[PDB]
Write a protein that binds this ligand. Structure first.
Ligand code: HEM
Length: 137
C-alpha cells in the first residue's frame, strides 16, 4: 500500500528521486525551463552531478514527509502551505505539480513493482486541491 511505497522510496531515495524527476522532465520538457542549470544535459550527465542528486533527493524527502503525514492520502493544510510559500515555488501553478504527479504515477505503473499507484494519483489530486486552497494559481 501507500505506506509501504513510502518505505520503498525512502529506502533508495536518491535513485527514485532522480528517476522520477527525469521521467517528469522528459515527459513535460517545457518544465525544464524552471531548472535553468539542467537545460541541455542528458540523463546520465545529470546523474553524474551531485547537485542534481542533492536537489532531487531534498524534494523527494519533503514529498515523503508530506505523504507520511497524510491521512488516507489527504495531506495536512500546513504542508500544503509550506509548498506554496517556499520562495523557490513563487512562479508555480497547480499544473506544475499535476504534471509531476502524473509522471510519478506513470513511472510507478511502468515499474513492474506493486506500487499503490491509485493512492499516489489520489494523493497528487488532494495535494493539488490543497495547494490551490493555500493560494496557488
Ligand atoms: C510535492 C512536490 C514538491 C516538493 C515536495 C518540492 C520541494 C522542494 C524543495 C525541498 C526544494 C529545495 C531543494 C534544495 O534546497 O535543494 C525545492 C526547490 C525547487 N522546486 Fe520544488 N518541490 C515540489 C514540486 C515542484 C514542482 C512541480 C516544480 C516545478 C515544476 C518545482 C520547482 C522547484 C524549483 C525551481 C526549485 C528551486 C531549484 C533550486 O534552486 O535548487 N518544485 N522544491
Amino acid at each position: 500500500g501507500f505506506k509501504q511505497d513510502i518505505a520503498t522510496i525512502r529506502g533508495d531515495l536518491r535513485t527514485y528521486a532522480q528517476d522520477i524527476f527525469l521521467a517528469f522532465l522528459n515527459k513535460y520538457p517545457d518544465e525544464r525551463r524552471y531548472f535553468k542549470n539542467y537545460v541541455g544535459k542528458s540523463d546520465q550527465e545529470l546523474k553524474s552531478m551531485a547537485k542534481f542528486g542533492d536537489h532531487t533527493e531534498k524534494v523527494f524527502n519533503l514529498m515523503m514527509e508530506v505523504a507520511d503525514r497524510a491521512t488516507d492520502c489527504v495531506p495536512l493544510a500546513s504542508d500544503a502551505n509550506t509548498l506554496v510559500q517556499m520562495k523557490q515555488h513563487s512562479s508555480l501553478t497547480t499544473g506544475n505539480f499535476e504534471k509531476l504527479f502524473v509522471a510519478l504515477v506513470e513511472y510507478m505503473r511502468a515499474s513492474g513493482q506493486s506500487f499503490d499507484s491509485q493512492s499516489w494519483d489520489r494523493f497528487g489530486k488532494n495535494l493539488v486541491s490543497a495547494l490551490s486552497s493555500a493560494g496557488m494559481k
